[PDB]
Design a protein around this ligand. Sequence first.
Ligand SMILES: [Fe+3]
Length: 54
Amino acid sequence: MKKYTCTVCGYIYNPEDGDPDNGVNPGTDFKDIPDDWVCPACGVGKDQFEEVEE
Ligand SMILES: [Fe+3]
């Protein structure tokens, strides 16, 4: 799956590690993360993230 980055602070969501402390298990693609999840480093919503294209 692809990584997504927060365009406000630079945090990168990597689907292989998820964000387990906030209920996103490793192996969850960004689209499936519940829509109320926010960036763990700056608090903005998923709407500020962009797919990291390879
Ligand atoms: Fe952020």
